[PDB]
mmCIF file of N, CA, C and O in Angstrom:
data_model
loop_
_atom_site.group_PDB
_atom_site.id
_atom_site.type_symbol
_atom_site.label_atom_id
_atom_site.label_comp_id
_atom_site.label_asym_id
_atom_site.label_seq_id
_atom_site.Cartn_x
_atom_site.Cartn_y
_atom_site.Cartn_z
ATOM 1 N N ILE T 1 26.289 -20.403 72.132
ATOM 2 C CA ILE T 1 26.324 -19.742 73.578
ATOM 3 C C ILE T 1 26.380 -20.719 74.374
ATOM 4 O O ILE T 1 25.913 -21.853 74.423
ATOM 5 N N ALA T 2 27.205 -20.787 74.802
ATOM 6 C CA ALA T 2 27.923 -21.439 75.870
ATOM 7 C C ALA T 2 27.860 -21.805 77.603
ATOM 8 O O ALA T 2 26.500 -20.433 77.457
ATOM 9 N N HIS T 3 27.592 -22.603 77.915
ATOM 10 C CA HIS T 3 27.119 -22.789 79.538
ATOM 11 C C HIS T 3 27.559 -23.172 80.784
ATOM 12 O O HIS T 3 28.682 -24.386 79.871
ATOM 13 N N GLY T 4 27.849 -23.119 81.873
ATOM 14 C CA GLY T 4 28.370 -23.661 82.763
ATOM 15 C C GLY T 4 27.979 -25.069 83.850
ATOM 16 O O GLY T 4 28.908 -25.521 84.272
ATOM 17 N N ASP T 5 27.360 -25.799 82.219
ATOM 18 C CA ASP T 5 27.443 -27.471 82.619
ATOM 19 C C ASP T 5 28.443 -27.991 82.168
ATOM 20 O O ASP T 5 29.149 -27.849 81.725
ATOM 21 N N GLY T 6 27.628 -29.549 82.112
ATOM 22 C CA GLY T 6 29.093 -30.629 82.097
ATOM 23 C C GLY T 6 29.398 -30.990 80.492
ATOM 24 O O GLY T 6 29.687 -31.802 79.571
ATOM 25 N N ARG T 7 28.160 -30.378 79.380
ATOM 26 C CA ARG T 7 28.502 -30.581 78.641
ATOM 27 C C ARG T 7 29.662 -29.713 77.355
ATOM 28 O O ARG T 7 30.573 -29.166 77.784
ATOM 29 N N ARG T 8 29.576 -30.764 76.796
ATOM 30 C CA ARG T 8 30.987 -30.031 75.146
ATOM 31 C C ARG T 8 30.662 -28.817 74.824
ATOM 32 O O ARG T 8 29.748 -28.189 74.799
ATOM 33 N N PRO T 9 32.024 -28.009 74.433
ATOM 34 C CA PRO T 9 32.433 -27.112 74.435
ATOM 35 C C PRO T 9 31.414 -26.816 72.058
ATOM 36 O O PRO T 9 31.813 -27.983 71.965
ATOM 37 N N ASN T 10 31.401 -25.470 71.981
ATOM 38 C CA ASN T 10 30.876 -25.739 70.787
ATOM 39 C C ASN T 10 31.942 -25.017 70.057
ATOM 40 O O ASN T 10 31.841 -23.891 69.889
ATOM 41 N N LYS T 11 32.281 -25.631 68.600
ATOM 42 C CA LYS T 11 33.335 -25.418 67.798
ATOM 43 C C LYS T 11 32.398 -24.617 66.948
ATOM 44 O O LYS T 11 31.015 -24.772 66.318
ATOM 45 N N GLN T 12 32.898 -23.547 65.767
ATOM 46 C CA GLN T 12 31.544 -22.272 64.794
ATOM 47 C C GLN T 12 31.871 -23.391 63.924
ATOM 48 O O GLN T 12 31.978 -23.914 63.666
ATOM 49 N N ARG T 13 30.298 -23.317 62.959
ATOM 50 C CA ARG T 13 30.257 -23.917 62.041
ATOM 51 C C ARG T 13 29.995 -23.152 60.824
ATOM 52 O O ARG T 13 30.316 -22.414 60.902
ATOM 53 N N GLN T 14 29.193 -23.952 59.575
ATOM 54 C CA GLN T 14 29.811 -22.846 57.840
ATOM 55 C C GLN T 14 28.623 -24.021 57.396
ATOM 56 O O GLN T 14 28.833 -25.369 57.634
ATOM 57 N N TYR T 15 27.634 -23.414 56.938
ATOM 58 C CA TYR T 15 26.577 -23.598 55.723
ATOM 59 C C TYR T 15 26.814 -23.455 54.337
ATOM 60 O O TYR T 15 27.429 -22.419 54.469
ATOM 61 N N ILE T 16 27.538 -23.809 53.825
ATOM 62 C CA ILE T 16 26.900 -24.248 52.213
ATOM 63 C C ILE T 16 26.615 -25.371 51.379
ATOM 64 O O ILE T 16 25.712 -25.784 51.411
ATOM 65 N N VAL T 17 25.058 -23.742 50.357
ATOM 66 C CA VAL T 17 23.611 -24.790 49.871
ATOM 67 C C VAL T 17 24.069 -23.786 48.760
ATOM 68 O O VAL T 17 23.988 -22.837 48.781
ATOM 69 N N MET T 18 23.556 -25.151 47.419
ATOM 70 C CA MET T 18 23.590 -24.998 45.885
ATOM 71 C C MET T 18 22.650 -24.736 45.596
ATOM 72 O O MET T 18 21.462 -26.128 46.182
ATOM 73 N N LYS T 19 22.210 -23.939 44.954
ATOM 74 C CA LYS T 19 20.701 -23.590 44.038
ATOM 75 C C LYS T 19 21.223 -23.801 42.770
ATOM 76 O O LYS T 19 22.424 -22.979 42.154
ATOM 77 N N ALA T 20 20.042 -23.858 41.608
ATOM 78 C CA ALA T 20 20.626 -24.149 40.301
ATOM 79 C C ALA T 20 19.077 -24.022 39.526
ATOM 80 O O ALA T 20 18.220 -24.012 40.396
ATOM 81 N N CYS T 21 18.764 -22.687 38.369
ATOM 82 C CA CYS T 21 18.097 -23.263 37.350
ATOM 83 C C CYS T 21 17.253 -24.379 37.273
ATOM 84 O O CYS T 21 18.695 -25.528 37.142
ATOM 85 N N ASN T 22 16.189 -24.039 36.733
ATOM 86 C CA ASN T 22 14.865 -24.783 36.577
ATOM 87 C C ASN T 22 14.949 -24.613 34.326
ATOM 88 O O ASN T 22 14.259 -22.987 34.989
ATOM 89 N N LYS T 23 15.060 -24.757 33.179
ATOM 90 C CA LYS T 23 15.422 -24.235 31.956
ATOM 91 C C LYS T 23 13.138 -25.258 32.381
ATOM 92 O O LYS T 23 12.760 -26.516 32.403
ATOM 93 N N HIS T 24 12.527 -23.701 31.110
ATOM 94 C CA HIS T 24 11.300 -24.317 31.458
ATOM 95 C C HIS T 24 11.128 -23.883 29.398
ATOM 96 O O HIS T 24 11.742 -23.099 29.184
ATOM 97 N N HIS T 25 9.671 -24.162 28.885
ATOM 98 C CA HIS T 25 10.408 -24.115 27.344
ATOM 99 C C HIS T 25 8.465 -23.896 26.866
ATOM 100 O O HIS T 25 7.820 -24.923 27.832
ATOM 101 N N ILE T 26 7.901 -23.735 26.076
ATOM 102 C CA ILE T 26 6.545 -22.950 25.750
ATOM 103 C C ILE T 26 6.321 -23.254 24.121
ATOM 104 O O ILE T 26 8.205 -22.726 23.294
ATOM 105 N N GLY T 27 5.610 -24.112 23.530
ATOM 106 C CA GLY T 27 5.517 -23.415 22.273
ATOM 107 C C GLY T 27 4.284 -23.334 22.388
ATOM 108 O O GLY T 27 3.169 -24.353 22.510
ATOM 109 N N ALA T 28 3.263 -22.302 21.290
ATOM 110 C CA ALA T 28 1.730 -22.515 20.237
ATOM 111 C C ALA T 28 2.301 -22.252 18.710
ATOM 112 O O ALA T 28 3.509 -21.992 18.165
ATOM 113 N N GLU T 29 1.158 -22.698 17.993
ATOM 114 C CA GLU T 29 1.679 -23.513 17.062
ATOM 115 C C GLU T 29 0.151 -22.648 16.261
ATOM 116 O O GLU T 29 -0.902 -22.432 16.730
ATOM 117 N N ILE T 30 0.361 -21.905 14.883
ATOM 118 C CA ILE T 30 -0.840 -21.104 14.435
ATOM 119 C C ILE T 30 -0.001 -21.444 12.947
ATOM 120 O O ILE T 30 0.349 -21.889 12.040
ATOM 121 N N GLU T 31 -1.145 -21.923 12.331
ATOM 122 C CA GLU T 31 -1.775 -22.069 11.141
ATOM 123 C C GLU T 31 -2.301 -20.689 10.765
ATOM 124 O O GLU T 31 -3.282 -19.707 10.546
ATOM 125 N N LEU T 32 -2.164 -20.363 9.205
ATOM 126 C CA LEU T 32 -2.350 -19.323 8.392
ATOM 127 C C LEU T 32 -2.810 -20.307 6.825
ATOM 128 O O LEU T 32 -2.175 -20.513 6.527
ATOM 129 N N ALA T 33 -3.404 -19.541 6.785
ATOM 130 C CA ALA T 33 -3.791 -19.874 4.882
ATOM 131 C C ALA T 33 -3.044 -19.475 4.243
ATOM 132 O O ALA T 33 -3.003 -18.597 4.137
ATOM 133 N N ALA T 34 -3.230 -20.560 3.293
ATOM 134 C CA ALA T 34 -2.046 -20.179 2.162
ATOM 135 C C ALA T 34 -2.933 -19.108 0.836
ATOM 136 O O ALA T 34 -1.884 -18.435 0.190
ATOM 137 N N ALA T 35 -3.930 -18.692 1.236
ATOM 138 C CA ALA T 35 -4.751 -17.942 -0.188
ATOM 139 C C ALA T 35 -4.212 -17.093 0.814
ATOM 140 O O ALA T 35 -4.045 -15.550 0.343
ATOM 141 N N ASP T 36 -5.316 -16.394 1.567
ATOM 142 C CA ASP T 36 -4.315 -15.335 3.098
ATOM 143 C C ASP T 36 -3.121 -14.719 3.151
ATOM 144 O O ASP T 36 -3.119 -14.223 3.105
ATOM 145 N N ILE T 37 -1.922 -16.064 3.207
ATOM 146 C CA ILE T 37 -0.581 -15.375 2.658
ATOM 147 C C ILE T 37 -0.712 -14.509 1.089
ATOM 148 O O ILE T 37 0.232 -13.579 1.239
ATOM 149 N N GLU T 38 -1.464 -15.552 0.690
ATOM 150 C CA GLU T 38 -0.847 -14.305 -1.213
ATOM 151 C C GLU T 38 -1.400 -13.277 -1.337
ATOM 152 O O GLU T 38 -0.887 -13.050 -1.745
ATOM 153 N N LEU T 39 -2.808 -13.603 -1.160
ATOM 154 C CA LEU T 39 -3.671 -12.048 -1.459
ATOM 155 C C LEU T 39 -3.260 -10.948 -0.641
ATOM 156 O O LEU T 39 -4.191 -9.826 -0.771
ATOM 157 N N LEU T 40 -2.652 -10.850 0.364
ATOM 158 C CA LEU T 40 -2.082 -10.308 1.570
ATOM 159 C C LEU T 40 -0.721 -9.417 -0.630
ATOM 160 O O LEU T 40 -0.946 -8.190 0.568
ATOM 161 N N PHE T 41 -0.303 -10.026 -0.800
ATOM 162 C CA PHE T 41 0.750 -9.840 -2.046
ATOM 163 C C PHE T 41 -0.290 -9.237 -3.352
ATOM 164 O O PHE T 41 0.460 -8.665 -4.191
ATOM 165 N N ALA T 42 -1.488 -9.887 -3.673
ATOM 166 C CA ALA T 42 -2.008 -9.437 -5.066
ATOM 167 C C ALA T 42 -2.443 -8.405 -4.810
ATOM 168 O O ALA T 42 -2.353 -7.328 -3.742
ATOM 169 N N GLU T 43 -2.485 -7.738 -6.263
ATOM 170 C CA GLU T 43 -2.736 -6.591 -5.898
ATOM 171 C C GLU T 43 -4.082 -6.050 -6.116
ATOM 172 O O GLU T 43 -4.696 -6.558 -6.749
ATOM 173 N N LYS T 44 -4.464 -4.953 -5.723
ATOM 174 C CA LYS T 44 -5.547 -3.683 -5.739
ATOM 175 C C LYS T 44 -5.936 -3.801 -7.259
ATOM 176 O O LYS T 44 -5.804 -3.299 -8.211
ATOM 177 N N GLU T 45 -7.366 -4.270 -7.464
ATOM 178 C CA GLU T 45 -8.277 -3.992 -8.597
ATOM 179 C C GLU T 45 -10.074 -3.436 -8.972
ATOM 180 O O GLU T 45 -9.738 -2.061 -9.126
ATOM 181 N N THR T 46 -10.517 -3.329 -8.036
ATOM 182 C CA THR T 46 -11.563 -2.992 -8.141
ATOM 183 C C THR T 46 -12.135 -2.579 -6.453
ATOM 184 O O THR T 46 -11.433 -2.780 -4.976
ATOM 185 N N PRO T 47 -12.744 -1.665 -5.984
ATOM 186 C CA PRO T 47 -13.434 -1.611 -4.555
ATOM 187 C C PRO T 47 -14.632 -2.937 -3.500
ATOM 188 O O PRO T 47 -14.207 -2.834 -2.537
ATOM 189 N N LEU T 48 -14.570 -3.751 -4.699
ATOM 190 C CA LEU T 48 -14.534 -5.008 -3.501
ATOM 191 C C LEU T 48 -13.438 -5.972 -3.344
ATOM 192 O O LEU T 48 -13.735 -6.776 -2.399
ATOM 193 N N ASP T 49 -12.317 -5.328 -3.759
ATOM 194 C CA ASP T 49 -10.876 -5.945 -3.780
ATOM 195 C C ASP T 49 -10.121 -6.191 -2.200
ATOM 196 O O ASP T 49 -9.174 -5.881 -1.908
ATOM 197 N N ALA N 1 -18.968 7.133 -42.334
ATOM 198 C CA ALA N 1 -18.229 7.071 -42.035
ATOM 199 C C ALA N 1 -19.520 7.352 -40.602
ATOM 200 O O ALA N 1 -21.008 8.552 -40.723
ATOM 201 N N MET N 2 -19.523 6.994 -39.159
ATOM 202 C CA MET N 2 -20.373 7.040 -38.110
ATOM 203 C C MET N 2 -20.135 6.900 -36.624
ATOM 204 O O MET N 2 -18.588 7.424 -36.919
ATOM 205 N N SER N 3 -20.997 7.460 -35.566
ATOM 206 C CA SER N 3 -20.275 8.217 -34.441
ATOM 207 C C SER N 3 -19.804 6.967 -34.109
ATOM 208 O O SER N 3 -21.619 6.109 -33.426
ATOM 209 N N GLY N 4 -20.122 6.895 -32.780
ATOM 210 C CA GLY N 4 -19.965 5.502 -31.729
ATOM 211 C C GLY N 4 -18.805 6.720 -30.086
ATOM 212 O O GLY N 4 -17.621 7.694 -30.186
ATOM 213 N N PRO N 5 -19.821 5.641 -29.391
ATOM 214 C CA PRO N 5 -18.637 5.819 -28.000
ATOM 215 C C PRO N 5 -17.097 5.126 -28.121
ATOM 216 O O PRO N 5 -16.752 4.596 -28.973
ATOM 217 N N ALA N 6 -16.553 6.014 -27.844
ATOM 218 C CA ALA N 6 -14.803 5.567 -27.165
ATOM 219 C C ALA N 6 -14.316 5.125 -26.469
ATOM 220 O O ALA N 6 -13.930 4.533 -27.380
ATOM 221 N N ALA N 7 -15.224 4.327 -25.248
ATOM 222 C CA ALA N 7 -14.533 3.724 -24.474
ATOM 223 C C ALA N 7 -15.824 2.707 -24.251
ATOM 224 O O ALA N 7 -16.677 2.835 -24.858
ATOM 225 N N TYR N 8 -15.597 1.224 -23.032
ATOM 226 C CA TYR N 8 -16.655 1.087 -22.999
ATOM 227 C C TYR N 8 -17.716 1.592 -21.986
ATOM 228 O O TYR N 8 -17.167 2.927 -21.233
ATOM 229 N N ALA N 9 -19.186 1.448 -20.757
ATOM 230 C CA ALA N 9 -19.380 1.636 -20.346
ATOM 231 C C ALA N 9 -18.239 0.807 -18.577
ATOM 232 O O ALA N 9 -18.504 -0.038 -19.004
ATOM 233 N N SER N 10 -17.903 1.914 -17.444
ATOM 234 C CA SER N 10 -18.258 1.072 -16.381
ATOM 235 C C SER N 10 -19.177 0.492 -15.335
ATOM 236 O O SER N 10 -20.104 1.747 -16.012
ATOM 237 N N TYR N 11 -19.086 -0.116 -15.383
ATOM 238 C CA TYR N 11 -20.434 -0.440 -13.769
ATOM 239 C C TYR N 11 -18.966 -0.741 -12.765
ATOM 240 O O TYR N 11 -18.647 -2.108 -12.685
ATOM 241 N N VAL N 12 -18.933 -0.306 -11.437
ATOM 242 C CA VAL N 12 -17.775 -0.978 -10.216
ATOM 243 C C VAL N 12 -19.215 -1.367 -8.701
ATOM 244 O O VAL N 12 -19.660 -0.491 -9.067
ATOM 245 N N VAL N 13 -18.438 -2.015 -8.574
ATOM 246 C CA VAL N 13 -19.502 -2.026 -7.191
ATOM 247 C C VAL N 13 -19.381 -1.188 -6.320
ATOM 248 O O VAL N 13 -20.443 -2.087 -5.090
ATOM 249 N N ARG N 14 -18.975 -0.133 -6.434
ATOM 250 C CA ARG N 14 -18.637 0.764 -5.176
ATOM 251 C C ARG N 14 -19.803 1.405 -4.460
ATOM 252 O O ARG N 14 -20.577 1.269 -5.341
ATOM 253 N N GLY N 15 -19.100 1.395 -3.030
ATOM 254 C CA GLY N 15 -20.924 2.559 -2.591
ATOM 255 C C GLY N 15 -21.823 1.818 -1.686
ATOM 256 O O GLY N 15 -21.638 0.350 -1.588
ATOM 257 N N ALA N 16 -23.140 1.261 -1.911
ATOM 258 C CA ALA N 16 -23.940 0.552 -1.354
ATOM 259 C C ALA N 16 -24.189 -0.806 -1.978
ATOM 260 O O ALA N 16 -25.172 -1.391 -0.713
ATOM 261 N N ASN N 17 -23.914 -0.614 -3.048
ATOM 262 C CA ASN N 17 -23.894 -2.477 -3.543
ATOM 263 C C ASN N 17 -22.912 -3.107 -3.400
ATOM 264 O O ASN N 17 -22.733 -4.391 -2.996
ATOM 265 N N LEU N 18 -21.816 -2.508 -1.969
ATOM 266 C CA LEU N 18 -20.521 -3.120 -1.873
ATOM 267 C C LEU N 18 -21.759 -4.183 -0.720
ATOM 268 O O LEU N 18 -20.868 -5.254 0.007
ATOM 269 N N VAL N 19 -22.007 -3.150 0.390
ATOM 270 C CA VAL N 19 -22.838 -4.149 2.105
ATOM 271 C C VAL N 19 -22.968 -5.015 0.873
ATOM 272 O O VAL N 19 -23.535 -6.201 1.883
ATOM 273 N N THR N 20 -24.381 -4.601 0.066
ATOM 274 C CA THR N 20 -25.484 -6.127 -0.160
ATOM 275 C C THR N 20 -25.027 -6.833 -0.766
ATOM 276 O O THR N 20 -24.718 -8.460 -0.649
ATOM 277 N N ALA N 21 -23.399 -6.974 -1.615
ATOM 278 C CA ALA N 21 -22.260 -8.070 -1.764
ATOM 279 C C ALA N 21 -21.969 -9.189 -1.196
ATOM 280 O O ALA N 21 -21.397 -9.649 -0.962
ATOM 281 N N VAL N 22 -21.933 -8.062 0.092
ATOM 282 C CA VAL N 22 -20.734 -8.943 1.436
ATOM 283 C C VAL N 22 -21.424 -9.907 2.171
ATOM 284 O O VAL N 22 -21.512 -10.293 2.601
ATOM 285 N N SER N 23 -22.712 -8.651 2.506
ATOM 286 C CA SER N 23 -23.629 -9.277 3.426
ATOM 287 C C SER N 23 -24.666 -10.549 3.087
ATOM 288 O O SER N 23 -23.695 -11.319 3.895
ATOM 289 N N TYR N 24 -25.092 -9.661 1.497
ATOM 290 C CA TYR N 24 -26.311 -11.040 1.364
ATOM 291 C C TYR N 24 -25.268 -11.767 0.270
ATOM 292 O O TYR N 24 -24.084 -10.977 -0.262
ATOM 293 N N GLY N 25 -25.639 -12.463 -0.617
ATOM 294 C CA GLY N 25 -24.906 -13.080 -2.097
ATOM 295 C C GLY N 25 -26.079 -12.509 -3.091
ATOM 296 O O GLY N 25 -25.172 -12.871 -4.243
ATOM 297 N N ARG N 26 -26.127 -10.912 -2.870
ATOM 298 C CA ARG N 26 -26.992 -10.701 -4.313
ATOM 299 C C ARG N 26 -26.207 -9.359 -4.334
ATOM 300 O O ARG N 26 -25.261 -8.746 -3.654
ATOM 301 N N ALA N 27 -26.410 -8.148 -5.526
ATOM 302 C CA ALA N 27 -25.767 -7.105 -5.794
ATOM 303 C C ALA N 27 -26.851 -7.077 -7.374
ATOM 304 O O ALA N 27 -26.670 -7.370 -8.096
ATOM 305 N N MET N 28 -26.860 -5.388 -6.838
ATOM 306 C CA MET N 28 -28.157 -4.698 -7.914
ATOM 307 C C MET N 28 -26.810 -4.266 -8.958
ATOM 308 O O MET N 28 -25.704 -4.452 -8.536
ATOM 309 N N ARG N 29 -27.748 -4.226 -10.428
ATOM 310 C CA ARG N 29 -27.210 -3.393 -11.046
ATOM 311 C C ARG N 29 -27.687 -1.313 -10.924
ATOM 312 O O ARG N 29 -28.840 -1.289 -10.793
ATOM 313 N N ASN N 30 -27.182 -0.649 -10.470
ATOM 314 C CA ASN N 30 -27.561 1.231 -10.403
ATOM 315 C C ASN N 30 -28.307 1.084 -9.540
ATOM 316 O O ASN N 30 -29.184 0.515 -9.293
ATOM 317 N N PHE N 31 -27.959 0.583 -7.793
ATOM 318 C CA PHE N 31 -28.539 0.688 -6.499
ATOM 319 C C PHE N 31 -29.243 1.988 -6.224
ATOM 320 O O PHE N 31 -30.399 1.721 -5.938
ATOM 321 N N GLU N 32 -28.268 2.887 -6.796
ATOM 322 C CA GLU N 32 -28.913 4.208 -6.548
ATOM 323 C C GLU N 32 -30.091 5.235 -7.445
ATOM 324 O O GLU N 32 -30.865 5.901 -6.955
ATOM 325 N N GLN N 33 -30.028 4.592 -9.033
ATOM 326 C CA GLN N 33 -31.592 5.185 -9.238
ATOM 327 C C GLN N 33 -32.553 4.104 -8.737
ATOM 328 O O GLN N 33 -33.722 4.789 -9.015
ATOM 329 N N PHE N 34 -31.775 2.544 -8.435
ATOM 330 C CA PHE N 34 -33.377 1.884 -8.081
ATOM 331 C C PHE N 34 -33.748 2.165 -6.555
ATOM 332 O O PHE N 34 -35.151 1.379 -6.569
ATOM 333 N N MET N 35 -33.030 3.003 -5.460
ATOM 334 C CA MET N 35 -33.385 3.670 -4.424
ATOM 335 C C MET N 35 -34.237 4.789 -4.904
ATOM 336 O O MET N 35 -34.830 5.160 -3.900
ATOM 337 N N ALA N 36 -33.802 5.648 -5.374
ATOM 338 C CA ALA N 36 -34.737 6.654 -5.607
ATOM 339 C C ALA N 36 -35.548 6.735 -6.383
ATOM 340 O O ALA N 36 -36.928 7.384 -6.447
ATOM 341 N N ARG N 37 -36.501 5.496 -7.144
ATOM 342 C CA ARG N 37 -37.858 4.925 -7.807
ATOM 343 C C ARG N 37 -38.588 4.538 -5.956
ATOM 344 O O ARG N 37 -39.694 4.814 -6.608
ATOM 345 N N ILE N 38 -37.826 3.871 -5.642
ATOM 346 C CA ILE N 38 -39.224 3.056 -5.017
ATOM 347 C C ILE N 38 -39.457 4.839 -3.156
ATOM 348 O O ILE N 38 -39.936 4.290 -2.935
ATOM 349 N N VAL N 39 -38.004 4.527 -2.259
ATOM 350 C CA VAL N 39 -38.271 5.181 -1.619
ATOM 351 C C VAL N 39 -38.266 7.087 -1.140
ATOM 352 O O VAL N 39 -38.720 7.579 -0.990
ATOM 353 N N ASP N 40 -37.440 7.065 -2.092
ATOM 354 C CA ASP N 40 -37.772 8.412 -2.574
ATOM 355 C C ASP N 40 -39.172 9.318 -3.355
ATOM 356 O O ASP N 40 -39.360 10.554 -3.015
ATOM 357 N N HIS N 41 -39.099 8.585 -4.208
ATOM 358 C CA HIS N 41 -40.459 9.576 -4.937
ATOM 359 C C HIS N 41 -41.382 7.846 -4.970
ATOM 360 O O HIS N 41 -41.219 7.215 -6.802
ATOM 361 N N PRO N 42 -42.118 7.552 -3.912
ATOM 362 C CA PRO N 42 -43.201 5.556 -4.345
ATOM 363 C C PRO N 42 -44.054 6.665 -5.618
ATOM 364 O O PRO N 42 -44.625 7.758 -6.596
ATOM 365 N N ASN N 43 -45.178 5.650 -5.951
ATOM 366 C CA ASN N 43 -46.458 4.974 -6.874
ATOM 367 C C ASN N 43 -46.093 7.148 -8.223
ATOM 368 O O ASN N 43 -47.159 6.777 -8.267
ATOM 369 N N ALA N 44 -45.366 6.376 -8.320
ATOM 370 C CA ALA N 44 -45.167 6.925 -10.291
ATOM 371 C C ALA N 44 -45.261 5.867 -11.292
ATOM 372 O O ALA N 44 -44.471 4.973 -10.352
ATOM 373 N N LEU N 45 -46.211 6.639 -11.615
ATOM 374 C CA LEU N 45 -46.655 5.537 -12.458
ATOM 375 C C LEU N 45 -45.074 4.801 -13.876
ATOM 376 O O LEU N 45 -44.903 6.501 -14.049
ATOM 377 N N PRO N 46 -44.988 4.195 -14.293
ATOM 378 C CA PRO N 46 -43.708 4.216 -15.311
ATOM 379 C C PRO N 46 -43.751 4.706 -16.552
ATOM 380 O O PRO N 46 -44.993 4.409 -17.655
ATOM 381 N N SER N 47 -43.554 6.561 -17.263
ATOM 382 C CA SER N 47 -43.576 6.830 -18.176
ATOM 383 C C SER N 47 -42.378 6.825 -19.286
ATOM 384 O O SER N 47 -41.713 7.495 -18.203
ATOM 385 N N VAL N 48 -42.156 6.593 -20.305
ATOM 386 C CA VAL N 48 -40.613 6.585 -21.382
ATOM 387 C C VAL N 48 -39.906 7.979 -21.463
ATOM 388 O O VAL N 48 -38.823 7.613 -21.775
ATOM 389 N N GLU N 49 -40.890 8.724 -21.042
ATOM 390 C CA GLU N 49 -40.244 9.857 -21.665
ATOM 391 C C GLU N 49 -39.755 10.410 -20.650
ATOM 392 O O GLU N 49 -38.550 11.535 -20.857
#
């Protein structure tokens, strides 16, 4: 906005802004017993099995 | 020539035997006939006939 005092005039301006992503990683560890993975595949024998 | 059974006798831990086998460390043989002596018909003296 111009005005009538002795101040210098104002040229038009421009602003240029740069933004970027941030990478984030997540990890969880599960252990499964070897007998538990095995007997999911072993065959049915009896009602107690 | 004599007569005899053609196959073995089966014993399966199916039924109410399986609950006491998992929950406790023990298991009957013929739980159902063993239950009908105690709670279904008590105070009956044993008689071989």
